[PDB]
C-alpha cells in the first residue's frame, strides 16, 4: 500500500487520524483520516479551499476512493509548543506574530463561508519553522474554547472562533486555559466571572437559559488573568471576548487592529 501507518495522532470523536509514511512521496509523513458511510459537499468545500494554499492552514494532499483523507503531517500542535517553552515562557512578539498568522488563517476560512467551530490549542499546527496552521475543520469534549452562543445553543455564526481565538491567545501568556469549566453551564459560569454579566440586550432571545440564573456581578480586570499583557494585546482581546456576537470584532477587523503596528 502507498502509505504505511506508524502511530496514532490523538483520539477524537471525528474518527481515527494516523501519522504515516507517504512511500510513494520521499517517506515523508503524511496524517491519515478515513471517513464512514452533505458530506461530498464538505469535501468538495476543502478541496476547493485547497486550491489558494493559504500558508496558515493545513495542506490537504489526497482524497482518496470508503473515503481516505491524506494532509501533510505537522510534529506538534500549540499545546506542545506551550508545554515546552523555556521560563519565563513565550517571547512577546513570538505572541504577536503566532496570533497574526491565526487571524489570517482564520479570516481567510470565514471569507470562504467555512466556521472552524471547534477551535483549540490541539488543532493549532506549529511547523519546524513556526508557521501557525489551522486543522481539524470543515466536517460534520472540552468546552474551555467554546463561545458563549454556542454555550447557551442559540447562534453558531463565525464570531464563534474569535471568542476561540481570544481564550487562545491569553493561554499564550498564561500557557493555561483562562477558563477551565467541566460543564456548558459551569463554563458559561467561568466566564461571566470573568467579564461580567452582560446587559439584557445582549442575551440570546428563546434559549434554555436565562440571565437570571447567573449573578457573576461586575467584569474583574483582564490584567489579573493574563499577567504581561500589553494595553493594545488587552484591547484586542476584550473586543475577541465580548459576549454578543455581533458585537465581537471579525478576523479581519482583529488584523488592522493597532496590536499588530
Ligand atoms: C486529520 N485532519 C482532519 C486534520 O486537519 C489534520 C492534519 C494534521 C497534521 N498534523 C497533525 N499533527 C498533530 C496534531 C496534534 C497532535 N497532538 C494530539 C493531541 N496531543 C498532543 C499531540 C499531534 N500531531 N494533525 C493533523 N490533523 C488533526 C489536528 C488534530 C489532530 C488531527
Do not use: C, N
Given at each position: 500500500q502507498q502509505y504505511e501507518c506508524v502511530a496514532e495522532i490523538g483520539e477524537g470523536a471525528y474518527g481515527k487520524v494516523f501519522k504515516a509514511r507517504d512511500l510513494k512521496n520521499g517517506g515523508r509523513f503524511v496524517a491519515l483520516k478515513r471517513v464512514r458511510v452533505s458530506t461530498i459537499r464538505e469535501v468538495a468545500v476543502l478541496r476547493h479551499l485547497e486550491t489558494?494554499?493559504?500558508?496558515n492552514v493545513v495542506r490537504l494532499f489526497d482524497v482518496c476512493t470508503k473515503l481516505t483523507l491524506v494532509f501533510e503531517h505537522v510534529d506538534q500542535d500549540l499545546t506542545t509548543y506551550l508545554d515546552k517553552?523555556?521560563?519565563?515562557?513565550?517571547?512577546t512578539e513570538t505572541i504577536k506574530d503566532m496570533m497574526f498568522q491565526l487571524l489570517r488563517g482564520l479570516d481567510f476560512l470565514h471569507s470562504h463561508?467555512?466556521?472552524?467551530?471547534d477551535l483549540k490549542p490541539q488543532n493549532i499546527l506549529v511547523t519546524s519553522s513556526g508557521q501557525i496552521k489551522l486543522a481539524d475543520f470543515g466536517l460534520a469534549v472540552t468546552l474551555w474554547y467554546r463561545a458563549p452562543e454556542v454555550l447557551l445553543q442559540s447562534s453558531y455564526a463565525t464570531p464563534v472562533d474569535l471568542w476561540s481565538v481570544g481564550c487562545i491567545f491569553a493561554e499564550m501568556f498564561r500557557?493555561?486555559?483562562l477558563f477551565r469549566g467541566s460543564s456548558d453551564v459551569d463554563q458559561l459560569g467561568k466566564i461571566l466571572d470573568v467579564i461580567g454579566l452582560p446587559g439584557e440586550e445582549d442575551w440570546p432571545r428563546?434559549?434554555?437559559?436565562?440571565?437570571?440564573?447567573?449573578?457573576?456581578?461586575s467584569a474583574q480586570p483582564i490584567e489579573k488573568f493574563?499577567?504581561?499583557?500589553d494595553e493594545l494585546g488587552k484591547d484586542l482581546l476584550l473586543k475577541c471576548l465580548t459576549f454578543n456576537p455581533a458585537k465581537r470584532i471579525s478576523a479581519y477587523s482583529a488584523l488592522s487592529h493597532p496590536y499588530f503596528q
Open positions: 489558494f494554499e493559504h500558508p517553552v523555556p521560563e519565563p515562557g513565550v517571547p463561508r467555512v466556521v472552524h467551530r500557557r493555561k486555559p428563546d434559549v434554555a437559559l436565562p440571565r437570571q440564573a447567573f449573578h457573576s456581578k493574563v499577567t504581561d499583557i
